[PDB]
Design a protein around this ligand. Sequence first.
Ligand SMILES: CCCCCCCCCO[C@@H]1O[C@H](CO)[C@@H](O)[C@H](O)[C@H]1O
Ligand SMILES: CCCCCCCCCO[C@@H]1O[C@H](CO)[C@@H](O)[C@H](O)[C@H]1O
Ligand SMILES: CCCCCCCCCO[C@@H]1O[C@H](CO)[C@@H](O)[C@H](O)[C@H]1O
Ligand SMILES: CCCCCCCCCO[C@@H]1O[C@H](CO)[C@@H](O)[C@H](O)[C@H]1O
Ligand SMILES: CCCCCCCCCO[C@@H]1O[C@H](CO)[C@@H](O)[C@H](O)[C@H]1O
Ligand SMILES: CCCCCCCCCO[C@@H]1O[C@H](CO)[C@@H](O)[C@H](O)[C@H]1O
Ligand SMILES: CCCCCCCCCO[C@@H]1O[C@H](CO)[C@@H](O)[C@H](O)[C@H]1O
Ligand SMILES: CCCCCCCCCO[C@@H]1O[C@H](CO)[C@@H](O)[C@H](O)[C@H]1O
Lengths: 8, 8, 470, 470
Amino acid sequence: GGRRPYIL
Amino acid sequence: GGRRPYIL
Amino acid sequence: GPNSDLDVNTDIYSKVLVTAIYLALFVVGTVGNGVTLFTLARKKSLQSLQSRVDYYLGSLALSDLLILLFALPVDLYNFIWVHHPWAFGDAGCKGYYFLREACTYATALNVVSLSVELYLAICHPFKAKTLMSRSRTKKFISAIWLASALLAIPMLFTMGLQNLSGDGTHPGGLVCTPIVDTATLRVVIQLNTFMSFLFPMLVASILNTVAARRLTVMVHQIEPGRVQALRRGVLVLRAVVIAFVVCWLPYHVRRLMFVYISDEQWTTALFDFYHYFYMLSNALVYVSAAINPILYNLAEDLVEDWEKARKLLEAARKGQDDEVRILLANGADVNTADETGFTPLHLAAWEGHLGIVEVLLKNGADVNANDERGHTPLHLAAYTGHLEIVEVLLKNGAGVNATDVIGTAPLHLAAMWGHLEIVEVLLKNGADVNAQDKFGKTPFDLAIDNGNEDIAEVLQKAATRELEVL
Amino acid sequence: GPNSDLDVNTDIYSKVLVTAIYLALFVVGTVGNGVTLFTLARKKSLQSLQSRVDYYLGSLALSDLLILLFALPVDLYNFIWVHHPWAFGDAGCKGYYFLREACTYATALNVVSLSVELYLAICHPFKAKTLMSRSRTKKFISAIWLASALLAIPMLFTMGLQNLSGDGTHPGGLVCTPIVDTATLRVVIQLNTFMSFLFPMLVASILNTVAARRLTVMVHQIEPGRVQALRRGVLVLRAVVIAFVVCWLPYHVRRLMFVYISDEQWTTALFDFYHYFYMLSNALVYVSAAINPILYNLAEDLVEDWEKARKLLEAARKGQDDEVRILLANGADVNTADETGFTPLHLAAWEGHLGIVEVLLKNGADVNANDERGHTPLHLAAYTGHLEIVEVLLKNGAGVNATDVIGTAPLHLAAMWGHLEIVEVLLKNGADVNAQDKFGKTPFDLAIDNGNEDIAEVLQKAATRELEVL
Ligand SMILES: CCCCCCCCCO[C@@H]1O[C@H](CO)[C@@H](O)[C@H](O)[C@H]1O
Ligand SMILES: CCCCCCCCCO[C@@H]1O[C@H](CO)[C@@H](O)[C@H](O)[C@H]1O
Ligand SMILES: CCCCCCCCCO[C@@H]1O[C@H](CO)[C@@H](O)[C@H](O)[C@H]1O
Ligand SMILES: CCCCCCCCCO[C@@H]1O[C@H](CO)[C@@H](O)[C@H](O)[C@H]1O
Ligand SMILES: CCCCCCCCCO[C@@H]1O[C@H](CO)[C@@H](O)[C@H](O)[C@H]1O
Ligand SMILES: CCCCCCCCCO[C@@H]1O[C@H](CO)[C@@H](O)[C@H](O)[C@H]1O
Ligand SMILES: CCCCCCCCCO[C@@H]1O[C@H](CO)[C@@H](O)[C@H](O)[C@H]1O
Ligand SMILES: CCCCCCCCCO[C@@H]1O[C@H](CO)[C@@H](O)[C@H](O)[C@H]1O
């Protein structure tokens, strides 16, 4: 994993 | 008079 | 390669469906709120309270139009369709997030203020006639908007442009994103969840409930036209609060998800889920912006629903078997509740009315409904001393070991009030013979306390029966 | 010459007396709030609600210490004694005004939050047991402090250094003062008056009143220790709210005076008055910072005052002449009121009880007390039909033409309910024979409406009698 979203 | 306070 | 990581991977069907919902909510919301703003602006009311209420409804309309006209199109382009790069620059990134935050505070504070003006109209009419004025309400609405802008200032410092391309040089990797650590972002997201959502909606709910009850009492114990208008206002504002809470809960959960889930848990599956969750939760934000003008139009329907619910409560208590049948057939809320938190089933079990209990359960009444102290219908049946209702309730799946705030179970109540027959039936259905309340009292202890020597005996027998198990 | 204009001209006696009050409030406030903070920090409570309440009391204590340790000494030196020049630089000028503003919001928001947690404890105990948690209350108190800092940001931009010497170059003419126009200053002062004072204290008062009544009803209809503690909390919080409103009203009036009075009205007399008003209003701000720990210690006294007031209401209604005499002698509040707004005099006039009415008036009962709809004791006496009480009330100086929210006068009520004798006595004391309610009904119109043909006649006679004069 480790792929966090960038859109809040 | 026009001498209004400067301290709030 | 260069910006692969920034790809979102929502299917084309999702994007088209969400675009349809967004555009539908854009026209319904813009027409509804536009007509509201236009009408209210051109309107002159003789009665101070009508003027003042309209000023608040005008604020709510303005906040909704700002989100639908400015936030929605930007969101549709840069967060639904083209995830990267961001098109609208650094000021646009900060301005977009500032506007959205400030509008939530403005809505929340306008709703709470409305609920205070109604509370005073109903509960302090004479003081309200003097302490209130049109021009002072306008000044207060200005203060609300300034307060909303001030509480949104953190978004100017937490959000900005970043290049998230591999080496931070590719123009396609330029995104509008948080520019502060998780610890800082957590603080600002919690500020919004508390001060735009939880706190103000909890205060509006309390004021709205108390106002509704107080109106019923002050009516039951006057100006027909004022009561009619106030009853519509209370019930519309209740629908507004419920609509707000339902529409915003997913959004706050999504933002808490963004700062609380750890890198290791961020699978592609969870990443993929998030961007679908985003579509749903942002759709519900635009529903919030579009719904209020529709709710104003359902004012008479809301009064009818309320009249039906309240008639079912009297029907279930008074013992009008027929009245209950008819009201249920219409579509009266079977799981409605009074000021104490008693549902029709609570009131049926309390008064006897085996028939009405059977009729209510059949229609899908919540058998394990709690009043404000945690009493189920089974508690009430055990307390009064109605065996048949206890059997009927237990049959339909009533919790035999359900406890109130003090830890009182039905077995405590049966034993306390000299109901031998009920003690027997509760034990048979798996009632813990040695359940203790906050103060360590067992059903046996309560039996002896109230000179119920016969019931202490059967409970002693129930207790020794457990002991033989081993 | 060079800085003559900036001289304040409060006498030396004023400065010494104010210095004594300030230093007295510094030690009482610092010891009281210091001991509170220390104790609460070292404290571990088994019960969630006790922990949560203590977190709020700890916030209130911190805000009070910040004002007493940092604001008070700066105020004492640069606003009481040495008016010019300002000693503490630009950051000190902005920091001083930022800190004071932020502390008012923090106090206000902590009080409202406390009043919500108590309301839920009393009215939604079962939901409160689950929906509430120690760690979530801490997070919410953090959001309160951040919100308070954000709402105080305007003081960083509205306040700063200016040289008000003749030519703006003399170092003695350097003052901490507003650096924005009156229009901008008005906006920020109104923001504080609304959002730190009027709005939050109105919400805390409503929640505190409803909680107090609901506790009485839920008791009258349990955990003895919980009820005792909740009753103390409600009554302490009520004293805190009243203390806050009394202490801060002069301060908000002074700040509104500063932006609303025009140059031409600013005489030396008004200039001189202002700087005396400043001493009083800033003294009351430090009373606010020092009083809460004292109020916590008077919890049992507040419960006694409350028990006496409530016993006088029952004594005055039930018709216990002796009980009223004794309770008045003790020091029971003669002008106390119930949920409806009825004082003991209201309840005496309503039930008959000529004696109790005479006893109450003699002790200094407000004869023209209004319930929540604007009914005076004279309204109630006219409605029920007690002649002697009307004479006794009129004698003591009752308003014969006092109107409720609908515009109903006593003459309307006398005529409506077939009280000929009372119609006669009210007319004699200057009752307008053709007073109209909101719907245009005169006493005469109401007499005919309720088939009271004899009273319509006397009123006709009263009406024609007026006509012969003019
Ligand atoms: C409220 C949501 C609006 C989002 C779309 C706004 C687009 C504004 C783009 O214009 C320019 O952007 C630059 C970026 O830094 C600024 O330098 C400049 O001043 C500004 O004129
Ligand atoms: C270019 C994007 C638009 C951003 C600015 C939107 C307007 C902000 C809200 O205005 C407010 O309107 C109220 C009347 O409802 C007034 O009471 C209040 O004084 C005023 O401040
Ligand atoms: C996205 C939310 C934007 C809200 C920004 C804060 C607006 C409040 C500023 O004060 C108001 O400015 C008006 C002019 O606009 C004046 O008419 C009014 O008297 C004054 O009180
Ligand atoms: C000789 C008397 C022995 C008394 C034994 C009972 C324990 C004493 C009370 O303990 C404390 O009670 C507080 C409530 O006041 C709690 O909030 C706190 O968490 C708890 O530690
Ligand atoms: C809450 C009230 C606190 C008031 C006391 C603060 C005293 C600080 C004075 O120090 C000076 O402050 C200047 C600000 O412009 C600095 O630039 C300068 O280096 C420094 O010498
Ligand atoms: C010149 C004096 C220095 C100014 C700063 C004083 C401290 C400001 C208040 O701190 C707050 O204390 C709360 C504990 O009650 C926490 O909940 C919150 O997270 C924290 O932010
Ligand atoms: C004059 C009053 C000034 C009040 C300023 C309050 C800002 C608090 C920002 O958030 C808090 O920052 C703390 C940093 O230590 C954390 O401990 C805490 O968890 C967090 O929530
Ligand atoms: C406004 C403050 C509210 C605090 C909420 C906690 C109330 C607890 C009161 O004391 C406790 O009451 C119990 C009865 O329920 C007793 O069993 C116990 O011995 C006693 O310590």
